């Protein structure tokens, strides 16, 4: 006689699980500056920027793949890590969306129309460590992962490539850093900066800032907070 159905969802589900990165805006603007896509805690809401209203909603319960992945009724781990505009599989299809959640999933879906009720599912290999950050220049993809062997977490940098087979996601095992205090990536996506307690072990001061280039080996510098800070502090 009575049926229950979830109707409205709120909280934007920002990356509270990381708590180290200062660029936490999961929401991004499209290639054409017309639609803003925010992945909520229960749905994915796309808003046309001129009329200010929700132009499309994507309910995880209404889909069958997002219910079996995002709406699990026992664990709250998997939240949306990053959206990507262009298609990872094919080069530059227009109205595609690539979703990366916490645990190595790639969900390719279609907005601007009807969601075809079978989004493209691709599990990336080597998902032992959890996915934290993911970005790209042209062609090659880069993934920053959080690893645990002093309540501090190593950062493992992998280079991701595709288009060999369907399921296969080729990794290159770029680099690794032992522990990080406060990491941030520039808005260009080619440079990151991190710290470590290895300098708290080796020297007096508790940290040194190290800036690392991603797609090359140009800016790979390290310098201490003893050289950074003054003496009044």
């Amino acid at each position: 006689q009575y049926k229950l159905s979830v109707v409205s969802g709120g909280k934007p589900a920002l990356n509270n699980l990381s708590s180290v990165t200062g660029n936490k805006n999961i929401a991004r603007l499209s290639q054409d500056q017309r639609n803003y896509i925010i992945p909520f805690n229960n749905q994915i809401k796309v808003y046309s920027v001129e009329t200010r209203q929700c132009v499309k909603t994507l309910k995880f319960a209404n889909n069958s793949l997002l219910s079996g992945i995002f709406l699990q009724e026992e664990e709250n781990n998997e939240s949306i890590v990053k959206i990507l505009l262009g298609d990872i599989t094919v080069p530059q299809q227009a109205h595609l969306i690539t979703v990366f959640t916490n645990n190595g999933h790639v969900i390719v879906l279609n907005y601007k129309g009807k969601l075809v009720e079978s989004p493209k599912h691709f599990k990336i290999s080597l998902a032992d460590e959890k996915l934290a950050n993911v970005f790209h220049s042209e062609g090659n993809y880069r993934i920053l992962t959080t690893f645990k062997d002093n309540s501090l977490q190593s950062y493992r940098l992998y280079a991701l490539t595709f288009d060999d087979a369907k399921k296969q996601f080729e990794v290159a095992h770029q680099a690794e850093w032992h522990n990080v205090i406060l990491s941030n990536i520039s808005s260009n996506g080619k440079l990151l900066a991190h710290m470590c307690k290895d300098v708290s072990t080796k020297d007096h001061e508790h940290k040194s800032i190290s800036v690392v280039s991603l797609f090359d080996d140009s800016v790979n510098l390290s310098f201490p907070l003893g050289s950074i800070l003054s003496s009044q502090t």
């Binding site: 049926k3 979830v6 229960n42």
Partner: peptide, 14 residues
């Protein structure tokens, strides 16, 4: 109309 700890509203209805 019932609420969740996450800001979520559900409706039990006919």
């Amino acid at each position: 109309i019932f609420l969740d700890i996450e800001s979520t509203l559900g409706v039990v209805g006919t």
